[PDB]
Amino acid sequence: QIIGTVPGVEVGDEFQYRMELNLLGIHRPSQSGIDYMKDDGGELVATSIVSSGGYNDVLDNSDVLIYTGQGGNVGKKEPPKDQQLVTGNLALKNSINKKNPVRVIRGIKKNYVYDGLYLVEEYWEETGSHGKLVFKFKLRRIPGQPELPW
Amino acid sequence: QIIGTVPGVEVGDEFQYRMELNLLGIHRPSQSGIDYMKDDGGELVATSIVSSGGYNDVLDNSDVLIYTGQGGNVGKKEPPKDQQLVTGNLALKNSINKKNPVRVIRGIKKNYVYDGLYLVEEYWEETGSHGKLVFKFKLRRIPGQPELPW
DNA sequence: ACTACGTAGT
DNA sequence: ACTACGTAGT
Ligand SMILES: [Mg+2]
Ligand SMILES: [Mg+2]
Ligand SMILES: [Mg+2]
Ligand SMILES: [Mg+2]
Ligand SMILES: [Mg+2]
Ligand SMILES: [Mg+2]
């Protein structure tokens, strides 16, 4: 697994299945929206995220993206509960301090497009109608990359 | 979807994922063990089955295979119930009379191998320890095809 | 064992 | 809506 640009993967490239992102090293998980690793000194850091309408996120053609954390049963669900600051959610949070590039794959209505590298600027806790905590991650697209239309 | 041999697919060919069987027209479903269609006169007929240890089936190097029907919660399960003679289970049963070739894909411990064409000779009802009905399909490998080792 | 922004078909 | 002999990762 790598952090940042993946060789042979261009901004704007389109993919049919999630497993292609696995083979090409873009996004290893099969379902999980967030992928991560441990760096020099076992601290979780995000490497790639996928926003395909599975949660609350609505994507516009801006440079700033709001990404919802995983868990708490929101989307394909089961009774609601608090989200946890572990694994992918934790990794995205640590990526704020480490200032590492995070790949972003957007789902299109074949089905996936690589939109380039982003930086996790911050995060916070929201309390939806459930009565439970959800995480929101504010990511900004690193300037210089090719633009993509929608 | 086709009945019988698929062009470019040889007996002994190996595949990594189920979706390859979908693309090459070997086995369209993503999880379901049985694939089927309606022929001239809307009667369900099986086209391909997959035996990858998901149920009770144990495969030897014989020409006769015993295939368990789907449903009734057996394998990845949820309370037990009777299996139903619908869809794939029904299609395999009708394939007995229609005497049509049925493709067989065996799972290996990359992960899938095409073992050739089979004929559904018969079927019957078993009553497991659940107290519920399960279907058993007796298939025989059509003579003449290349042999495969295990 | 459990999770998980999957995936096709009916 | 529901099903389903999936699939990777922890
Ligand atoms: Mg909001
Ligand atoms: Mg028996
Ligand atoms: Mg669908
Ligand atoms: Mg149906
Ligand atoms: Mg596994
Ligand atoms: Mg874990």
Residue numbers in the entry:
A (entry chain A), B (entry chain A): 362 to 438, 442 to 473, 484 to 524
Excerpt from the publication:
In Arabidopsis, the SRA domain of the SU(VAR)3-9 HOMOLOG (SUVH) histone methyltransferase recognizes 5 mC (mC) in different sequence contexts and methylation statuses. The recognition of methylated DNA is required for the maintenance of the repressive marks 5 mC and histone H3 lysine dimethylation (H3K9me2), and for silencing the transposable elements and gene transcription in plants. Our studies are the first to establish that SUVH5 SRA specifically binds 5 mC and 5 hmC bases, but exhibits weaker affinities towards 5 fC and 5 caC modified bases. SUVH5 is unusual among the SRA domain proteins, as its SRA domain efficiently binds methylated and hydroxymethylated CG DNA, as well both the hemi- and fully modification statuses.
To understand the molecular mechanisms of SUVH5 SRA-mediated recognition of fully-5 hmCG DNA, we determined the crystal structure of SUVH5 SRA in a complex with a self-complementary 10-base pair duplex containing centrally located 5 hmC-G pairs with a 3′ “T” overhang. The biological assembly of the complex, two SRA molecules bound to duplex DNA, is generated by the crystallographic two-fold axis perpendicular to the DNA helical-axis. The symmetrical 5 hmC bases from the adjacent base pairs are flipped out and positioned in the binding pocket of individual SRA molecules. Gln392, located on the thumb loop (connects α1-helix and β2-strand), inserts into the minor groove and substitutes for the flipped out 5 hmC in the duplex DNA. In addition, Gln392 forms intermolecular hydrogen bonds with the Watson-Crick edge of the orphan guanine and stacking interactions with the flanking bases, thereby compensating for the extrusion of the 5 hmC bases from the DNA double helix. The flipped out 5 hmCs are tightly positioned in the pocket via parallel-displaced π-stacking interactions with Tyr416 and Tyr428, and by intermolecular hydrogen bonds between its Watson-Crick edge and the side chain of Asp418. The hydroxyl group of 5 hmC participates in intermolecular interactions with the side chain of Tyr428 and the main chain nitrogen of Gly394 from the thumb loop. Our structural analysis revealed that the flipped-out 5 hmC adopts a similar conformation in the binding pocket and has a similar distribution of intermolecular interactions as that of the flipped-out 5 mC in the crystal structure of the SUVH5 SRA-fully-5 mCG complex. 5 hmC binding induces a conformational change in the pocket, and the wall region (Gly414-Asp418) is reorganized to accommodate bases larger than 5 mC. The penalty for accommodating a larger base, 5 hmC, in the binding pocket may be compensated by the hydroxyl group specific interactions, thereby accounting for the insignificant difference in the binding affinity between fully-5 mCG and fully-5 hmCG for SUVH5 SRA.
